[PDB]
Ligand binder design. Sequence first.
Ligand code: EQS
Lengths: 293, 292
Amino acid sequence: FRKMAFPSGKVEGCMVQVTCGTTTLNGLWLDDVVYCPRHVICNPNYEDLLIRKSNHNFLVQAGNVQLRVIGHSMQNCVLKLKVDTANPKTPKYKFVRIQPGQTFSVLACYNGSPSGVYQCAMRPNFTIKGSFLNGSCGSVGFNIDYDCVSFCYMHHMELPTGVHAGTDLEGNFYGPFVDRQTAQAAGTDTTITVNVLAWLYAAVINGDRWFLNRFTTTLNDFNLVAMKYNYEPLTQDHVDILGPLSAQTGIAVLDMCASLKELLQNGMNGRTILGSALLEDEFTPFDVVRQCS
Amino acid sequence: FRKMAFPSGKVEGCMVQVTCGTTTLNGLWLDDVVYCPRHVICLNPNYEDLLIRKSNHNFLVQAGNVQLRVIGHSMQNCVLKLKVDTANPKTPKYKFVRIQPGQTFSVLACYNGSPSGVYQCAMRPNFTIKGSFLNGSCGSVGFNIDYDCVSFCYMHHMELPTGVHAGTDLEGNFYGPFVDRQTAQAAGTDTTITVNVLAWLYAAVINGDRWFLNRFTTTLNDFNLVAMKYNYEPLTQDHVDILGPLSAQTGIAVLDMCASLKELLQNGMNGRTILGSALLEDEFTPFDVVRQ
Ligand SMILES: *[C@H](O)[C@H](C[C@@H]1CCNC1=O)NC(=O)[C@H](CC(C)C)NC(=O)OC1CC2(CCN(C#N)CC2)C1
């Protein structure tokens, strides 16, 4: 199994740079709106900072071509700059707010120019482990379903521990973070249980099934046990997204939970699963199906 | 640290679907030529004979919801070249390159001429690649980007019984001793790309991971004796030179990192992990580590 990003071309066609004074970050140009982190305008009072701004103070560029700003507004932590040109490369798109544990592709950009693409999992504490250098703010995270781009992340900051935090495309942070340059702590991270379960299903699909036990369990039982091992509690949505893999294998989700509970309490007893002594938690049920099928 | 592919947009604009008979795979449309694996034309295939028997009209080439008219065809090594009557307006600046083993490249995996995923691969010393390629992936390409120029280095042809993959450059020459016939083929013994493992250990130190460092040291030759024993590639002096920037940046001499790797090979990691991995990783070049 490989971490595999979506092809980035449809998002590349939407990347621009936004500059206030000397401060440049990336923006997302969809139809006639450019979306970018509000801290391009800088414990700040963003509303009073924004009131002082006029359209003509914002430099928006696609490459070296200026896009004239004709309106500006703030939605939570994102600035929306209305521009006078509809992006001819606008894909079919939606804005979605993902759940922790879900994965997405990031197009890392600097000065509006893409540098690389890679897959991220959002940790249960709402941080991501990116590759985000200075000037990466406004880089976006996305999934692609058919020809529809689902934008789910916009990058804003790095935490003291080196992980990253940002918002959805409506400007609402993932996690208990603010776009102030203050010291901020993420919750203690946990292992993404639903993704480990997906991984075990993937092992079964490939014929590696020694760890399957003859018992089952309750979701509450598992969640109480799993908390002792630094595993995220399962939600009903988690059970639901395992449905296709459960159907593919005939193994009930709660039967797989019992198998995982046994692995956690007893360990691997010297064995490997998919050729690894470590359980993997960065592949979602969707990722497993994409790469097997 | 993180495996990072090049942005794939310039390659996406070149992918088309090619069908002959009941066989469908991907092609690369640059200017007015579509490049694809010649096994689209079909256990011992005489491709020259099968090719003489094909008509231009036998080849169904689609760029999305548009058929492209094949006005000509030829074969260079294991690559079929279909001349079409329309030039691809999205053709980027490009070159065809043959990569060296241990170098890396991005793969745009495609099915039915539609891009599905992008990821980073290395050309293994035994000239296989560890890809994620399913039925219908043939003709997917590998590439690097330098400035705005796309350097195409790989086109996908086959899977080996061990689950690794083999293909050609865009001139149609296989990497490795493989043949485009439907036989189970084994690769040579693979070996580990030492200079990349060292680059990755330096990446681990930059990210604050340093439990594996030691005060021990070693000569280049004594390192290489132990490396070869564990089926690692010998480290050349040019590879030492290539590691210079990461050495400067960390203040850890290349041969000091070699001494740490020797200890890792001899003992193991004893449950410990490096950058999250129970295994020593060898598909990051020095350049890949520096650029990031
Ligand atoms: C072209 O799309 C296809 C891609 C292969 C098919 C599935 N994954 C791939 O990479 N290439 C071929 O079908 C190729 C044509 C000949 C070289 C003319 N033949 C091929 O790759 O055969 C493979 C199947 C194989 C046996 C089953 N194994 C297991 N488990 C792995 C490899 C030999």
